[PDB]
């Protein structure tokens, strides 16, 4: 109905709240220097006890007067926490954003250094903030426009050897980025700070159970972390210009994305891990079926990919996407078209290995057609093999030789143009392992044709 409770989850987020709750200091003598007030002076030290359960709201008045009092440092988190359990209270309720959300001017003087300053007092401070920022009943932007930029904020989110700070600057945010109106101005205005999420999961090169300093790690927290981050990454992203464009800024960091699941899961992660890269290759965005292809050439992992398809997960929810992913993911490949990327390859004169020949069987179905060519091109892919300094263009020279095993031996005597035994010979002399391998297979094939 109105707002929610949000962030009931942490220690870090939660250990300076009961740091403050669980005591408090007397305010009768707070009203003497006039941080408080004189004429309604009987509820700014009322907090204790107004917090106890009895028989909208009754007070809205006064305390608009001591929030503009409030003009200074120490006491705004104290009051910040009052305020977020208060607003906690379903009892009294929180019908009172109606009425502050005419012009809320109460958070411009808690803001300009909120966000800044000392840590704690930014964590406080944020609770609040967004809390009631959700809420819509009038413009909220500017009061996000004003929110993003800072400079201490930024470091809060720069914290990475000690993960508490961007913890919280996260989970709000994915508390916060829910509506399209702030998802898509605030990424107007974070596309530098990526790396965070980059370590928040590069980490997990080296990992062991047992290991590590983290106590009651990701009971609420630990890869609680990693979930928000991932969620609120994915989340964000469904504007299509925005992974439009962060897949070709960041391809590679996107690329071992995969790696992801490649050993290690756990319970939440499966719905997500590669759920963006869904949309990445939705049929609703530019480049939807342009990039994945060497994402694909590049990771290979696709018969493992498939190998994560069949153990069994508990969850319905996702062996629908993750079998869409894999059966689009096979009908362009074998699709790709042969002997048009091939030729269209050869004579641009740069190649890479592109193992898609050496994949041959339907390669093969038609290289009748390819004797209709009569490769030619071939002939000149021969001046190619004399001289070559590209690994892969002199390896895959030996792999085009070596198809014929799938080929009839009327490609024998067209060969017989070619024969001259040392070529290879001396090719073969070259025992660079890399290549090496496949040259066994091409000096072999001569003969074991001649038992073909």
Same mark, same amino acid.
């Given at each position: 109905?109105?707002?929610?409770?949000?962030?009931?989850?942490?220690?870090?987020?939660?250990e300076?709240?009961?740091?403050?709750?669980?005591?408090?200091?007397?305010?009768?003598?707070?009203?003497? &220097?006039?941080?408080?007030?004189? @004429?309604?002076?009987?509820?700014?030290?009322?907090?204790?006890?107004?917090?106890? *359960?009895?028989?909208?709201?009754?007070? $809205?008045?006064?305390?608009?007067?001591?929030?503009?009092?409030?003009?200074?440092?120490?006491?705004?988190k104290?009051?910040?926490n009052? @305020?977020?359990? #208060?607003?906690?209270?379903?009892?009294?309720?929180?019908?009172?954003?109606?009425?502050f959300?005419?012009?809320?001017k109460?958070?411009?003087?808690?803001?300009?250094?909120?966000?800044?300053?000392?840590?704690?007092?930014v964590?406080?401070?944020?609770?609040?903030?967004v809390?009631?920022?959700?809420?819509?009943?009038?413009?909220?932007?500017? +009061?996000?426009? *004003?929110?993003?930029?800072?400079?201490?904020?930024?470091?809060?989110?720069?914290?990475?050897?000690?993960?508490?700070?961007?913890?919280?600057? @996260?989970r709000?945010?994915?508390e916060?980025?829910?509506?399209?109106?702030? !998802?898509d101005?605030?990424?107007?205005?974070? *596309?530098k700070?990526?790396?965070?999420?980059?370590?928040?999961?590069?980490?997990?090169?080296?990992?062991?159970?047992?290991?590590?300093?983290?106590?009651?790690?990701?009971?609420?927290?630990?890869?609680?972390?990693?979930?928000?981050? +991932? $969620?609120?990454?994915?989340?964000?992203?469904?504007?299509?210009?925005?992974?439009?464009?962060?897949v070709?800024?960041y391809?590679?960091?996107?690329l071992? #994305?995969?790696k992801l699941?490649?050993? /290690?899961?756990?319970?939440?992660?499966?719905?997500?891990?590669?759920?963006?890269?869904?949309?990445?290759?939705? /049929?609703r965005?530019?480049?939807?079926?342009?990039?994945?292809?060497? $994402?694909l %050439?590049?990771?290979?992992? #696709?018969?493992?990919?498939?190998?994560?398809?069949?153990?069994?997960?508990?969850?319905?929810?996702?062996?629908?996407?993750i079998s869409? %992913?894999?059966?689009?993911?096979?009908?362009?490949?074998?699709?790709?078209?042969?002997?048009?990327?091939?030729?269209?390859?050869?004579?641009?004169?740069?190649?890479?290995? &592109?193992?898609?020949?050496?994949?041959?069987?339907?390669?093969?179905?038609?290289?009748?057609?390819?004797?209709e060519?009569?490769?030619?091109?071939?002939?000149?892919?021969?001046k190619?093999?004399?001289?070559?300094?590209?690994?892969?263009?002199?390896?895959?020279?030996?792999?085009?030789?070596?198809?014929?095993?799938?080929?009839?031996? !009327?490609?024998?005597?067209?060969?017989?143009?070619?024969?001259?035994?040392?070529?290879?010979?001396?090719?073969?002399?070259?025992?660079?392992?890399?290549v090496?391998?496949?040259? %066994?297979?091409?000096?072999?094939?001569?003969?074991?044709?001649?038992?073909?």
């Open positions: 109905m109105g707002a929610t409770k949000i962030l009931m989850d942490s220690t870090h987020f939660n300076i709240r009961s740091i403050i709750r669980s005591r408090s200091v007397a305010w009768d003598a707070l009203a003497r &220097s006039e941080e408080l007030s004189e @004429i309604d002076a009987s509820t700014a030290k009322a907090l204790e006890s107004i917090l106890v *359960k009895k028989n909208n709201g009754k007070t $809205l008045i006064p305390l608009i007067h001591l929030l503009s009092t409030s003009d200074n440092e120490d006491c705004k104290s009051v910040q009052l @305020i977020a359990e #208060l607003l906690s209270s379903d009892k009294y309720g929180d019908d009172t954003v109606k009425f959300q005419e012009d809320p109460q958070l411009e003087q808690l803001f300009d250094v909120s966000l800044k300053g000392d840590f704690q007092t964590l406080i401070s944020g609770f609040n903030v809390s009631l920022l959700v809420q819509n009943g009038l413009h909220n932007v500017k +009061l996000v426009e *004003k929110l993003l930029k800072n400079n201490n904020l930024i470091n809060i989110l720069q914290n990475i050897e000690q993960m508490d700070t961007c913890y919280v600057c @996260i709000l945010l994915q916060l980025a829910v509506i399209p109106e702030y !998802r101005v605030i990424w107007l205005h974070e *596309k700070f990526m790396p965070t999420l980059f370590k928040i999961l590069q980490r997990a090169t080296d990992s062991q159970l047992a290991t590590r300093i983290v106590a009651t790690n990701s009971n609420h927290l630990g890869i609680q972390l990693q979930y928000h981050s +991932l $969620l609120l990454i994915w989340l964000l992203t469904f504007n299509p210009v925005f992974a439009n464009e962060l070709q800024k391809l590679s960091d996107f071992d #994305l995969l699941v490649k050993i /290690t899961i756990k319970e939440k992660v499966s719905r997500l891990c590669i759920s963006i890269i869904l949309q990445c290759c939705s /049929t965005v530019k480049q939807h079926k342009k990039v994945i292809k060497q $994402l %050439l590049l990771g290979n992992a #696709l018969p493992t990919v498939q190998s994560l398809s069949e153990r069994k997960y508990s969850d319905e929810e996702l062996r629908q996407d869409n %992913l894999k059966e689009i993911l096979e009908n362009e490949y074998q699709e790709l078209t042969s002997f048009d990327e091939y030729s269209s390859e050869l004579k641009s004169g740069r190649l890479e290995w &592109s193992p898609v020949h050496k994949s041959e069987k339907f390669w093969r179905e038609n290289a009748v057609r390819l004797n060519k009569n490769y030619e091109l071939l002939k000149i892919l021969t190619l093999l004399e001289v070559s300094d590209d690994p892969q263009v002199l390896a895959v020279a030996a792999h085009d030789v070596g198809e014929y095993v799938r080929h009839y031996p !009327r490609g024998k005597r067209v060969i017989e143009q070619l024969g001259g035994k040392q070529l290879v010979m001396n090719h073969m002399h070259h025992e660079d392992q890399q090496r391998y496949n040259a %066994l297979l091409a000096v072999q094939k001569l003969m074991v044709h001649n038992w073909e």
